[PDB]
Amino acid sequence: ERLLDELTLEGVARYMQSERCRRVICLVGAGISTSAGIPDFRSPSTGLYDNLEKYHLPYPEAIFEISYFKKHPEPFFALAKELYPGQFKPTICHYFMRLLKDKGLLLRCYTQNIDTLERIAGLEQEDLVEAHGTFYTSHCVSASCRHEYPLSWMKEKIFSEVTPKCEDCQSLVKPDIVFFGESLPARFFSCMQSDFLKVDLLLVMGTSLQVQPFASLISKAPLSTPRLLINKEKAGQSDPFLGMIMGLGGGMDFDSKKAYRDVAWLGECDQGCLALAELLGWKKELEDLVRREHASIDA
Amino acid sequence: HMERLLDELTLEGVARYMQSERCRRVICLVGAGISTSAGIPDFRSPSTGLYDNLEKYHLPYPEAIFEISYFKKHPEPFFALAKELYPGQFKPTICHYFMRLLKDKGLLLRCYTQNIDTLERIAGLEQEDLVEAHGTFYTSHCVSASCRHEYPLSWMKEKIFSEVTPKCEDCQSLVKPDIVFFGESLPARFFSCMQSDFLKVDLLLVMGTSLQVQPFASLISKAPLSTPRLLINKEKAGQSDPFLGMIMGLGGGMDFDSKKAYRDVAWLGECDQGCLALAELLGWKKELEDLVRREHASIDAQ
Ligand SMILES: Nc1ncnc2c1ncn2[C@@H]1O[C@H](COP(=O)(O)OP(=O)(O)OC[C@H]2O[C@H](O)[C@H](O)[C@@H]2O)[C@@H](O)[C@H]1O
Ligand SMILES: Nc1ncnc2c1ncn2[C@@H]1O[C@H](COP(=O)(O)OP(=O)(O)OC[C@H]2O[C@H](O)[C@H](O)[C@@H]2O)[C@@H](O)[C@H]1O
Ligand SMILES: NC(=O)[C@H]1CCCc2c1[nH]c1ccc(Cl)cc21
Ligand SMILES: NC(=O)[C@H]1CCCc2c1[nH]c1ccc(Cl)cc21
Ligand SMILES: NC(=O)[C@H]1CCCc2c1[nH]c1ccc(Cl)cc21
Ligand SMILES: NC(=O)[C@H]1CCCc2c1[nH]c1ccc(Cl)cc21
Ligand SMILES: [Zn+2]
Ligand SMILES: [Zn+2]
């Protein structure tokens, strides 16, 4: 069933202004924060996974892999000390999602990021699913213990160059950011079970959709729900190939003759959000919000 | 409405379903575990699997040897393994001949195989019965997309057993057999058969696979929600809690053991013995045994 009058940004904008479009879910990744100075993972040359050579890893992902971590925790904590102190401000894209909230359209933002820029831009707890966790809290990795530690305790250890250990059981303690091999937060599953039943539009921004189960989210919406991708490159579309991340047919179809609801706007997330905001008549409103908020942070 | 087709979640329940009028079309989903009893190692069995046995090639990770990007940078390890695996002949197993019985009883809609050993064909399945999902070593191709010149089996055998890394005659790019590496497209037949077959499948028989690679792993989720799915395998496969980096799409797995289980059965053991057990329940045990004896004797005839 086809709800967009045309498969373009303009078509998505007209749909957003129709009575049909009440509930919008944003699905976001590291691409929405590169313009703020935080590298992504998988972009050639600049991405984090192309810049870990000094840690002497078997493959880049090992630095956030739970089995490797337990055996060799030192690289992760060395990287954490290098990355933690960074100070960053939300992007136009983050403020666009804030505007969706204030306009009453945002059902939920599911984020793969741990930078907290969604919260800094003014989205609240109930608007967010921090799918790949948070550094705000930390836990002992032992399943029979799971002692919780606050951010202050973790910083005390990290910047003291002591490998954080649990005071009860001496097991490693790590921030609640989700590693390969680890469970996702309970909130991911409880929100996912209900949010996708009546969603009217998916807005996918700044992600390569290369990790499960987050990549499955696009297939959870009803088949009639349009999906707009704002990203530098097409993501989620391919023929069947061995080792593909998406389930069979769970991807996007922007370009086949059977394409009916997916739109790819290729370019920078910030510029896509500006372009869409203009089509919605919100451009002036977004720009002021950005300027005031960036000014407020500088103070 | 959820149609509960199995009267109990057991091999016995599955056999009763198979004998009913409701079970007309079976799809078999198979992997390397159906050929280990013939002498061919699997991939992911601890210690014995191929991926725990590649140390001498000093690969970055085991899957690199069957990965197209790595291959293009370092093709020698693949061909050095291909020398170690191209020789030797194998006979089909009881499990292969069980699939042959399904064919000859008009029950086999399709066998989707991740194997390149061709044992399904040697067991008497014909081309139309089969989706060789991960390719064939019978044909080869230049890796350059603009070229893609095809080369026959003899050409590839000539090059590999000359210990020369095969290059394309039209463009000098690497040539490899049409077995599917990580990063490579599956044959178009895979998708075309899947879209049709999975609309009309009455039972999935999943044997000898860990379901750890996509898109093959997705096939279980393409069956109608009521279609029972029987796993015959050493270990449970396709049933796990979600985690970051999981292979299956969310909700796309087997459910043998939860409070909501209604159609998935795991029979844990060797595929040959599981097929014998099932055949005995169906009244086919002697027929199967006779078939295996006959066909093996015939192969030994030359
Ligand atoms: N300014 C920009 N505008 C538009 N697109 C951009 C921009 N910057 C980057 N991109 C695109 O943005 C995308 C960034 O893709 P990836 O780097 O894979 O990050 P993820 O968040 O999806 O990684 C997911 C998980 O993987 C990790 O293991 C962690 O667990 C992560 O949480 C690319 O398509 C870029 O082209
Ligand atoms: N005799 C046996 N009986 C029953 N189960 C067995 C037996 N032998 C092994 N097993 C089980 O059989 C399963 C073997 O699983 P895997 O070794 O992953 O092989 P695949 O075919 O799924 O590999 C898929 C692709 O991955 C590669 O990259 C290639 O591309 C492959 O085509 C395990 O669960 C064993 O416990
Ligand atoms: N610095 C920040 O505002 C954020 C920015 C995103 C990356 C990041 C932050 N905090 C971290 C703590 C530990 C580890 Cl391993 C990574 C990070
Ligand atoms: N901008 C971000 O927050 C991205 C990029 C900074 C490192 C990071 C991000 N997402 C993550 C999810 C899990 C883990 Cl372990 C680390 C990260
Ligand atoms: N030997 C056989 O009948 C088959 C048996 C399965 C493994 C195998 C065969 N042929 C091959 C050609 C190349 C590579 Cl890399 C592997 C194989
Ligand atoms: N029994 C088999 O055919 C298995 C085990 C032998 C090597 C092998 C099998 N399946 C494959 C699929 C792709 C590639 Cl590149 C290699 C193989
Ligand atoms: Zn503890
Ligand atoms: Zn060529």
Residue numbers in the entry:
A (entry chain B): 56 to 354
B (entry chain A): 54 to 355
Passage from the reporting paper:
Using the diffraction data obtained from the soaked crystals, we were able to solve the crystal structures of Sirt2 in complex with ADPR and either EX243 (EX243 is the S-enantiomer of EX527; Sirt2–ADPR–EX243 structure) or CHIC35 (Sirt2–ADPR–CHIC35 structure) by molecular replacement. The asymmetric unit contains two monomers that show no significant differences [r.m.s.d.s of 0.29 Å (Sirt2–ADPR–EX243) and 0.23 Å (Sirt2–ADPR–CHIC35) for all Cα atoms]. The ADPR molecules of both structures assume a position that is almost identical to that observed in the Sirt2–ADPR complex. To our surprise, each Sirt2 molecule contained well defined electron density for two indole molecules. One indole mimics the physiological sirtuin inhibitor nicotinamide and occupies the C-pocket and the adjacent extended C-site. The other inhibitor molecule binds to the selectivity pocket of the hinge region. The carboxamide of both indole inhibitors binds in a similar fashion as the carboxamide moiety of the physiological inhibitor nicotinamide and hydrogen-bonds to the highly conserved residues Ile169 and Asp170 and, via one of the water molecules (W24 in Sirt2–ADPR–CHIC35 and W206 in Sirt2–ADPR–EX243), to Ala85, Ile93 and Pro94. The amide of the indole hydrogen-bonds to Gln167 and, via the other highly coordinated water (W3 in Sirt2–ADPR–CHIC35 and W203 in Sirt2–ADPR–EX243), to Asp168 and ADPR. The binding of the hinge molecule is mainly driven by hydrophobic inter­actions with the side chains of Ala135, Leu138, Tyr139, Phe143 and Phe190. The hinge molecule may supposedly be of no physiological relevance for Sirt2 inhibition, but it highlights the adaptability of the hinge region of Sirt2 and the selectivity pocket.
Sirtuins constitute a family of NAD+-dependent enzymes that catalyse the cleavage of various acyl groups from the ∊-amino group of lysines. Sirtuins consist of a highly conserved catalytic deacylase domain of around 275 amino acids that is flanked by unstructured N- and C-termini that differ in their length and in their sequence. Of the seven members of the human sirtuin family, Sirt2 is mainly found in the cytoplasm, while Sirt3 is the main mitochondrial deacylase.
